[PDB]
Amino acid sequence: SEELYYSVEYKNTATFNKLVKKKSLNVVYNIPELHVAQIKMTKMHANALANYKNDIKYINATCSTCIDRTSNESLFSRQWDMNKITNNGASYDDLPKHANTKIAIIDTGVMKNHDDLKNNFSTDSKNLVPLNGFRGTEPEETGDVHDVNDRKGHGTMVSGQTSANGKLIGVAPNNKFTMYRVFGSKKTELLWVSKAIVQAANDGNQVINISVGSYIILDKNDHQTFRKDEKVEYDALQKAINYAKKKKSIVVAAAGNDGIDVNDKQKLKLQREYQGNGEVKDVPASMDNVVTVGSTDQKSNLSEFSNFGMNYTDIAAPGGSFAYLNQFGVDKWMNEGYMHKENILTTANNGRYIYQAGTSLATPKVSGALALIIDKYHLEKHPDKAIELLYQHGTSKNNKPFSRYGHGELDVYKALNVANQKAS
């Protein structure tokens, strides 16, 4: 009588709804635009449902795969990472006069009342966490659409990198950001992330920042309706990304934080302790139509924790390092200044600040930059032109190889001054 969570890919809204009523299916999540739903049912009903060939494409069990720069109040001079990409703050004098692009952030939520974020916070922000949250195990989650308060703290850190405009300064200090909450206090579902991408794209956010990664199992050798891999989620996520592209939104994704060359299939399978036959992928970072951002340290070298590889990394931005911590131990690291040199200062969920590191802190820098580029050159109708400008004129050309840095480390000063070429 065991009832489990199944991910289902269906063929048609009208026939699916009709089938739901006929078999009284308990649909606990649904994304009409992608033809995917999550249904809670017995293994016996899951198997019978897989036999409705006119309506059901795939079914699999859902799994656990996842501007003041100089006043005495300014912390801008401590933001080494922000200084590095802006020519020490000079790029803030070249910002577009009107900052109309909306940056969507899909993450844990945000402290909307943080002093550095409140002016840029958009009330169009939405909660995608359903009533009762992860697998119905968090009754405090009411499914309230406007509740985007951050419980974990990560989303607040990310938002600061794109939009802080107070003591701390983000990459795009005059642009509004929209938070799409996909975490309660527990885990997230890739289906919630997919719905958040669709929502962001429908809300007109032309830049969508995804700091969440996950290693997903998919098996292209199996074509059965009822599957053992995570096919439905994979499809939902790639379809969400392509949906965003059709709506003229760019999706920016963080590379993973496991320091692995994603071309080494063996090392990837090891992330899910998987022995099938059988492939593991880092998603959405390795998916089609995503800008994949790797992380660099304070010396512009690739962070030791950053994933990388050919046909993966598109660009890199400062995300920090723990080299000093590993070399000198905790005591010397926090008390002799090293933490401050190799970690990223960002906005914290306590209304103050915190030092962190990771690709999730590099990615918002790139998202912010794309928002600036779209507004500066008026590329709203052709957002791919923003990506090409970023790649060809918005990075440093001192970083190599491509398999590690992609087109290079982000340089916002260069990206904003393409019309102001200087003869050398």
Binding site for Na ion (CB under 5 A): 96
Q: Is the dihedral of CA 77, 93, 248, 205 positive or negative?
A: positive
Compute the distance between CA of residue 270 and CA of residue 282 in angstroms, rounded to an integer: 12
Is residue 190 within 8 Å of residue 238, measured between CB atoms?
Answer: no
CB-based contacts of 220: which residues, under 8 Å, 6+ apart?
Answer: 279
In this chain, which residue has its C-beta nearest to Na ion?
Answer: 96
Choose between 96 and 383: whose C-beta lies nearer to Na ion: 96
Q: How far is the CB of 390 from Na ion (least distance, A)?
A: 17
Burial of 78 (0-12, 13-18, 19+ CB in 10 A): middle
Token pair for 246: 């059709």
Choose between 281 and 414: whose C-beta lies nearer to Na ion: 414
Position 51, amino acid: N
Token pair for 179: 């938070």
Active-site residue among 360, 375, 407, 411? 360
Give break positions in the chain: residue before each, C–N beyond 2.5 Å: 66
Active-site residue among 35, 114, 154, 407? 154
Residue with tokens 């995917």: 36
Q: What is the DSSP string of 195-212?
A: HHHHHHHHTT-SEEEE--
Active-site residue among 81, 107, 282, 375? 107
Q: How far is the CB of 95 from Na ion (least distance, A)?
A: 8
Residue 360 designated active-site: yes
| Four-point Cα dihedral 167, 172, 175, 180, nearest 10 | -90
Strands 103-107 and 207-210: parallel
Choose between 96 and 358: whose C-beta lies nearer to Na ion: 96
Choose between 246 and 422: whose C-beta lies nearer to Na ion: 422
Choose between 18 and 382: whose C-beta lies nearer to Na ion: 382
Residue 154 designated active-site: yes
Q: How far is the CB of 97 from Na ion (least distance, A)?
A: 5
Report how far apart, in Å, the C-alpha atoms of 407 and of each of 290, 314, 398 are.
Answer: 14, 6, 10
Q: How far is the CB of 100 from Na ion (least distance, A)?
A: 12
Q: How far is the CB of 92 from Na ion (least distance, A)?
A: 13
Choose between 302 and 372: whose C-beta lies nearer to Na ion: 372
Residue 396 designated active-site: no
Q: How far is the CB of 376 from Na ion (least distance, A)?
A: 6
Active site residues: 107, 154, 360
